[PDB]
Every structure is written in structure tokens, then in C-alpha cells.
């Protein structure tokens, strides 16, 4: 196996794939004028393809991923990197820099089980970015209900939808993708969600998604990501959204956020409770702690419904307001013992639900 490639063509692929010792190695394969680089943890897999325009020789090996990446990144801009398998070592040469890396046999590198695509669609990179960033923060962390640790991806009509929840708060975002889709839902594990996000880059390359019974695959440019799915029964966001949250409050997003952030300073460090007093065109936020310290914030808002008070975990509210990258927020209320729905006043595409505190 031999190839000579420009540093600039290796770097991004190496970074993407680099994200039982052999799991710490990358599989390198030179075949039909292409270098393929594969990384795996048995749960998911990233494969990058790089065209070889310079003379090359076929073959495959595996090499320590972090070391190979660090060597390549460490070389100067515009470096050419010549690679050849010699004996049980992989030689890396650029300029007068030389490196000899250990290898493990390509035959030992694990594969994911073969599977069939049942559901397929294409969508803009920007749409996937939007779907993930709108909801990611609401996924559970290390919950015994394993399926909450991931993210629901649901197709319905022509929309792709993400849902994330930890039982206390929920985020949902739906985006049109302009294709007739089957009604289908799968749960992507949190590490898979992280990877799907990482592969976007923000150019114009579209994303191609294939969904099987136990796998998801995403194709973008010369990269293929495959993950196992998570089994289990994800809650139904329609049951979490308040049935008729007809008390509507509108306020400046950053004004509201900074008021909550200040009140938070004097909330209970563990329980993080704050109280909201809603009245005609006014919101009052209060907080107190076991040390008897108190915060009070008063803001002007647009509100014409009945007066009510409601308690919330301020961290959950802040998370939502930080995820809303917008000018004005709408809060949609029911009563003191029911959830609040929060949205961008200018867009219905994402919705957030926070359960109250007694």
C-alpha cells in the first residue's frame, strides 16, 4: 500500500474519522484510485473517501488514529505526505520529517452488520443543523430510560422532526424537506447525534439519509456516517405540548434571559427554583435560597390574560432562551400546575415545553 497526498486533502478526513486496541486505529485502504479512511467504536462508523491523483499502490492496514492525525496536523501548510506500508510498520514521510507507526492487520478491523435501507431522503445541510441544534440540549444525560439519552428523528408527511426530552423538559423541531415521506421514527444515540452534527461543515453539499430497521446512514460530500439506532418507546411530544395554552406572553428574548440569569444567582443551588408572577403587561421574577437571600426582576411584557403565578427550574428556562436565537419569545401558559410552552414569537418551527415546579 502506497500513496502520496497533499496535507490539505488528508486533514479534514482524518479529523472526521478520528472523532480493544484496534478501535483506536483507523483502517486505511487504497483501492481503485481512492484512499478510504474508516474509524469505528462498534456502535457507529465514519468513512471518508479521498481521490488519489498521484501514483499509488493498493492495499490496506490500520494505524493509531490520534498519532496519525497529530503527525499530519503537525506538518507545515502545503506539505505533501507520502505513506507506505513496510513490513509491519507504516512509514510516513514529508519533507525531511519521517515517522514509523505501528499497525494492526486490516483483516482484524471490525465491520458493522450488513443491513438494508428502508427509508431514504435528501435535505440541506442547514436543515439538519437547524433540527439538531434546536433540540440537542434537551436530551437526557445518563437516564436509566436509555432511549431518552438519544434523539428521536421522525418523518411525517413531508417533514423531518427531531424530539429530545429528559422527562422534565422537551424540545421539538419540524422542518419541511419537500419529499413525500413515510410515517416513521427512529432514535439516534447521543454520540451519533454529536457525529451527525460534526459532519456538516456548513458548505452547500446536500445530506442523503438512509434509515434501516436498526441503522441510520448519512452521506455528505465524500463522507459516510453510519450509526446503530436505539430500541425503546420514545414519548409522544403531542401529549407533552399543552392542549390549550391560551394565556400568551410576549417578551424580548435577551431581556427575558438576562433577567432570569440574574434571578438565578439567588436560587437554590440544587433545585434552582424561581417564581413567575404574570399580570397585565408585566412579569415579575423572584428567587430565594436557604440563606434567605432574594432576587426580584420586573420586566414589561405583552400580556392581556388572567393573572397567575408559576414556579420553574430556572436552568431549564435559560436553556430554552439560549437555544432561541431570536428577538422575541412567546410563552404560552395554562395554569400554575401545568407545563409552559415557549417558542420564537416569529416562528412555529420549534417548540419547547418546561414542566412547572410545585
Amino acid at each position: 500500500m502506497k500513496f502520496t497526498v497533499e496535507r490539505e486533502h488528508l486533514l479534514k478526513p482524518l479529523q472526521q474519522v478520528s472523532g480493544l486496541p484496534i478501535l483506536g486505529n483507523l483502517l486505511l485502504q487504497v483501492a481503485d484510485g481512492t484512499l478510504s479512511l474508516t474509524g469505528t467504536d462498534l456502535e457507529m462508523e465514519m468513512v471518508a473517501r479521498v481521490a488519489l491523483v498521484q501514483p499509488h499502490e493498493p492495499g490496506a492496514t490500520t494505524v493509531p488514529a490520534r498519532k496519525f492525525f497529530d503527525i499530519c496536523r503537525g506538518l507545515p501548510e502545503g506539505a505533501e505526505i507520502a505513506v507506505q506500508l513496510e513490513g509491519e510498520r507504516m512509514l510516513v514521510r514529508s519533507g525531511r520529517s519521517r515517522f514509523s507507526l505501528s499497525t494492526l492487520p486490516a483483516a482484524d478491523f471490525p465491520n458493522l452488520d450488513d443491513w438494508q435501507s428502508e427509508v431514504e431522503f435528501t435535505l440541506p445541510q442547514a436543515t439538519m443543523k437547524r433540527l439538531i441544534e434546536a433540540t440537542q440540549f434537551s436530551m437526557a444525560h445518563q437516564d436509566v430510560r436509555y432511549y431518552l439519552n438519544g434523539m428521536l428523528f421522525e418523518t411525517e408527511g413531508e417533514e423531518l422532526r427531531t424530539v429530545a426530552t429528559d422527562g422534565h423538559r422537551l424540545a421539538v423541531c419540524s422542518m419541511p424537506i419537500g419529499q413525500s415521506l413515510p410515517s416513521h421514527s427512529v432514535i439516534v444515540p447521543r454520540k451519533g447525534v454529536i457525529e451527525l452534527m460534526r459532519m456538516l461543515d456548513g458548505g452547500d453539499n446536500p445530506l442523503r439519509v438512509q434509515i434501516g430497521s436498526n441503522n441510520i446512514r448519512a452521506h455528505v460530500g465524500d463522507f459516510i456516517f453510519t450509526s446503530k439506532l436505539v430500541d425503546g418507546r420514545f414519548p409522544d411530544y403531542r401529549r407533552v405540548l399543552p392542549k390549550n395554552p391560551d394565556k400568551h406572553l410576549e417578551a424580548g428574548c435577551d431581556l427575558l434571559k438576562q433577567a432570569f440569569a440574574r434571578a438565578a444567582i439567588l436560587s437554590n443551588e440544587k433545585f434552582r427554583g424561581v417564581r413567575l408572577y404574570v399580570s397585565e403587561n408585566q412579569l415579575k421574577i423572584t428567587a430565594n435560597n436557604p440563606e434567605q437571600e432574594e432576587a426580584e426582576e420586573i420586566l414589561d411584557v405583552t400580556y392581556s390574560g388572567a393573572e397567575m403565578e408559576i414556579g420553574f427550574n430556572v436552568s431549564y428556562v435559560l436553556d430554552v432562551l439560549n437555544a432561541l436565537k431570536c428577538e422575541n419569545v412567546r410563552m404560552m401558559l395554562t395554569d400554575s400546575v401545568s407545563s409552559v410552552q415557549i417558542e420564537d414569537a416569529a416562528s412555529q418551527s420549534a417548540a419547547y415545553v418546561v414542566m412547572p415546579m410545585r
Partner: peptide, 5 residues
């Protein structure tokens, strides 16, 4: 803290 579901 109340639960959603």
C-alpha cells in the same frame, strides 16, 4: 419538579 410524561 413535575414530570412531562
Amino acid at each position: 419538579q413535575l414530570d412531562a410524561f
